[model samples]
Target chain A: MPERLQVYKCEVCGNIVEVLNGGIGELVCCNQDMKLMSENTVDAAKEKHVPVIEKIDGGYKVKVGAVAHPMEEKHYIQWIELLADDKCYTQFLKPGQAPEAVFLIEAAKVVARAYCNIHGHWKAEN
Target chain B: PERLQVYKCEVCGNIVEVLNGGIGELVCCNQDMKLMSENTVDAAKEKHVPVIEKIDGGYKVKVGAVAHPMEEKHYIQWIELLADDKCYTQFLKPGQAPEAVFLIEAAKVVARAYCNIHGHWKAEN
Candidate 1:
């Protein structure tokens, strides 16, 4: 079966958040904005389609999607970019701004699991 | 204008594609999934335009905006019942579960806000 992951970008700071394989879906926050970002079902599904490359240590490598890039006229918009990879995507946050690492890690797992659910790949014992 | 493209459910493999929108307002999906419906009252709130309010029985009520379309109709589905004037967002999971206690409290706040905005007496307060 094909692997999948979801990714998000902090709209305010441009931070990249990747939801890896076997992850749960939950809202993530960057800096002090609690209600700035929320994930709907559609958002979750979109993240799951990002493509990735498996690395030597069982980890995967992926490029941030194009949706996460910064806009020329805007300074605070956090965009998520879907790259060429069918399994991977990237998030964009502002420079020098970092989200809670733990939250980011958890979000990766959520997006991954979401993808697995959508593809019906969770039923397969691999 | 950007042409809106609609793909088949079988071909897309559970994903959603929007026809047009600005950056940070769209979501890309991986697999082929049916598009669910959505609507919100904040349509013009972002553009600094005053939202139009309707009067019913001398009370002001904000009209619901058509944002997205849903597939299922006339079925017993889960929903978040918001009061007229509140800031709380409640999520109703698939099952037929009641709203959470915190959500109810938030609903009360919404009701009070609606009454205050419409020049009605705040009965609870």
Candidate 2:
């Protein structure tokens, strides 16, 4: 079977994106409203318009349209790297700038959702 | 005009558009009669029901699905790439080694077909 999948939506643009993850890691993102779009749900997005940018060393980066240039590009490049052990990394690269640590807490939540989808494990916070 | 074009297939994978040349000269992989018959290819085509037509320079592709009201058929957002040559590449995540070459001539046909359906800028071709 293939790995579990999760969806992420951009708050500003409403651009929905999906990530296929095996299982846990840190997901970092600068966007505050970057929330979990789905959990283990197939056919989450109606479009299924995933475009494969390029085949990297480990996995291929699939997105909506063209491959996004993190910096110096008008649109923000939302980076989500899925790792082992139900961990994933999410981040936003502002135009002409690298990802910042300011959104670590927010990124953590997205990662937590990905973990839940992968392991079917969820815990409520105090 | 949007000058970039991309083509993709299951066997040959993704193809990148390099330059604006003649139609046939802009393909990504060789024509594969066998792979076209695969269940996946037919299923994908049925899911989208693309109209394949041979035109002046090459072919044109179009697809649309009707809604309940039957007013207009919504088109699923899809894009195909075209490359100049063919190459084999390996993917680790899916744990499979597949060819990565694009049939340049056939890709041009697919691109032209897609452009006709999507109403893309033909001058860019």
Candidate 3:
């Protein structure tokens, strides 16, 4: 069973659905069961996919990697999200925008998640 | 400039959001969905207008200064923030507080709240 906040993507049409209310059953799109997206926390071969976090003036700044991820038309960071204080804060991105965002959340512990068009998902904590 | 577009199914009251650009029409419940437009002024300004305040990290949004009712029949369904060209939304249910907080900052900030019975309302800062 899919849980709340779990994301599923359609293979045929590239549609994405985030589970708002989780229940028993499968998510289907285009006659196929949508695949559940998994998070990638560690980087291999120095891929700039993992999220990096730093404390800033008001809250925190999140970046795709220590070496910034490319915001190219074909390959770019799709979104960046922060999980803190049991709440989720997200920033959607486009191809031309930077693969970074500032989240002014006042939480001591923060987990950053980022998604790249070619790299699936990445996670980090600070 | 095709970006996120929200659609509501009039027959079933189902809502769906398009995250990317699309060329075709959106259909739901075997019928064409209606595109939702933000309303700045509506039936009750004191109850529907979202109030924005700067907090420690981001902005705090309250549906109304008088505090909108969060009853089963009438409640705020969701709160959204359009900050720095990105959109973030928080869904709500009845029996919860009628407010939301977004830890985001941008030159242009817009807050929106959707009431189950009142459609959509917006405020900018």
Candidate 4:
């Protein structure tokens, strides 16, 4: 079964498809099978896709990575997400928009998540 | 009491500060001064104040936990450390979190983050 909020990326035009629910046969885009994004790696040197998590006012802030990504037209982060304390906060990004998003939850442990058009899916726990 | 935050327009490139907190409808460059949507407050719903922590080195700056992007488009231009009458700054680039861990021994310090898109953000613990 496809999991909830599953991310699928298209290799052709760098399109990302997130699964809203858990039910599908085959994810397709650009007449090609959408590839599922894998878990993030800790390669801070190269593939910087992990989001940085920190405590903030009202809630928490989640950024794309310790090493922020490019916001140029050719390559840029698409969005960012934070999931924890049984809640989810996400921010969609434009080419040059700050690759950051905030959430309102002063509860327990939290996890930071994000998606990049050039990269794929990345996450951080705090 | 509105706290003054600074904003510089990209077009016509005018800079402005809402001294009494960003109340509402600040206009510049033939348009309203759009509030920096990226906000990090201290457990307060309507506040974007950064939460300062007492770290081993000096202070831990958690910007909304949302580190400002250091990119060509929407990068954090600089992070200012304001203590008393002195201010220190550090510039950053893309792929870097819009946060800094300062090295000092000051009692009262305010972290200021300047975004290319969001303008200036003040941090208070």
Candidate 5:
């Protein structure tokens, strides 16, 4: 059964779907059962992949990594999500854009997540 | 307070806030961005210091115990609330009230306010 806020990704065509309303139905994509995005908190290599947050004038600025993840044609951050309690806000990105986003929201128990086109998912909590 | 290093470009009013902590120098407009020094002393206590009070939903940050002037020339630029882990800020215009309300509760709270003339001021509880 799919639960709320669970994201599924198609391994074949790279299509991602998030569960807004949970139900007992199979999320099919690319003619197969999509895989759940298991968030990775720690980096496996020397390069950093965790989402780092900083306080700005109006809201929190989220960066992909401490050293900034690549934003090239082959590798780039797809999207960043700020899950504030029950509500969630997302900022999408492209290849040429910077690997960062600013979310103008006031929330508690805030958690940040970033999806890399090559590196899958990364998460960080305040 | 473990606030990130914030740099302000003197040439342009562009502020480059460091999201990732690093050692490289922040440069803008062919000059180094000056790291903004946080002024702790409330020298202009009556006009700049922020006073925090517990309210119904969360907390109210008053610019000053005595109401500060909100003229176009001199006024509070912004108010920030660093409550525990999460951080929030409210920008103010010239004619707006010199106060901000944050509907969030935490064990430890640090309230900060920046005045266009008096620099930065902070209060914590």
Candidate 6:
């Protein structure tokens, strides 16, 4: 999947860049090839970074972890992404915000993805 | 890059992440990683994917026929081209746009441009 969007980071500088276009060769940072992160659908097993899917009246409720993640300025949930019915819905969060995000859509088998500012990417299925 | 986000620690000023599989938690000052807001191209003025065309050089990149603003308040901060496996990035100051023609490999490629207002865009030809 070098053609899809990609993200690379410099562990040294903490500089992160998203590749809107995919290409060959290494993504360099700090004079070294940047590390590439992958997406996951499996749960963390420890119950951290798991997507909690719930049924609600108007839509679905997606929470980041079984125990809600801290919503502080330093440690927080970035955003929640939902892939359902062939469409994507996103909610961006600020610091000190809740880890749970609500989605509006008809009942369907939806997959939810969330980015923990601390944890990379985690996903859950309904 | 990946939307996982990059952060600089406030306490140690260290850089860290989770997406790269660097291991353990990224905790400094006993806090988690914090994300940054996007600097996007302005939607109102002229926002479009980076245009590509044959050139005497390699390829020419432009925002739109009218072009993006090079103002201090607003501007395109950078441009990038991804072809095959090679990626190139060109940084811009507040007063520069209509990016310099890149001496790049011939490409049937994808293009990326970061606007200071509208976030990011992608294109292909």
Candidate models: Cα lDDT each = 0.23, 0.26, 0.72, 0.54, 0.66, 0.57
Q: What is the clash count of model 5? A: 0
Cα deviation in Å at residue A2, candidate 6? 2.9
lDDT sort, best first: 3, 5, 6, 4, 2, 1
- Judge candidate 6 against the unseen true structure and give its global Cα lDDT, from 0 to 1: 0.57
- Using lDDT as the measure, name the better of candidate 2 and candidate 4: 4
Cα deviation of A86, candidate 2, in Å:
19
| Model 2: CAPRI class | incorrect
Local accuracy of candidate 2 as per-residue lDDT tens digits, A31-107: 33334544334342212212223333333333322322233354333332322222232322235544221111111
DockQ of predictions, in order shown:
0.02, 0.01, 0.21, 0.02, 0.02, 0.03
Name the regions of candidate 2 deviating beyond 4 angstroms.
A1-4, A20-30, A39-126, B1-95, B98-106, B109-125
Best by DockQ: 3
Error of 3 at A123 (Å): 1.8
Stretches > 4 Å off in candidate 5 = A1-126, B1-3, B40-43
Per-residue C-alpha lDDT of model 4 across residues A1-126, encoded as one tens digit per residue? 235456655566444544322342454435556566775742443335777777876577777667777777766766666554323444556787777765555556877667665556677787
lDDT of 2 at B25: 23
Model 3 Cα lDDT, one tens digit per residue, B15-124: 55544443445444455656677773357878888999988657889997778999999999878788876677777879999999886646578888888788778899
CAPRI quality band, candidate 3: incorrect
For each candidate, what TM-score against the reference? Answer: 0.20, 0.20, 0.71, 0.45, 0.50, 0.45
RMSD of 3: 4.4
What lDDT is reached at residue B54 by model 2? 48
lDDT per residue, candidate 6, B1-105, as tens digits?
243333433444333322323433333345543333333334643455677776764666787556878788677656656555334445567766646444445
Report the poorest 10 consecutive residues by lDDT, candidate 4 chain B: B15-24
lDDT (tens digit, per residue) of candidate 1 on A1-126: 111233333344333323222222222224322121223333332323232322223222332221232222333223222222122222323433321011111112322111121221110000
Task: Report model 1's interface C-alpha RMSD after superposition on the true interface residues.
Answer: 13.6
Q: Which is the leading candidate under lDDT?
A: 3
lDDT of 4: 0.54
lDDT of 2 by residue, B3-106 (tens): 23322222333222211112222111333111121123322332334344444433333332211111123232222322222111111122112111111233
Residue A85 error for model 5, in Å?
A: 20
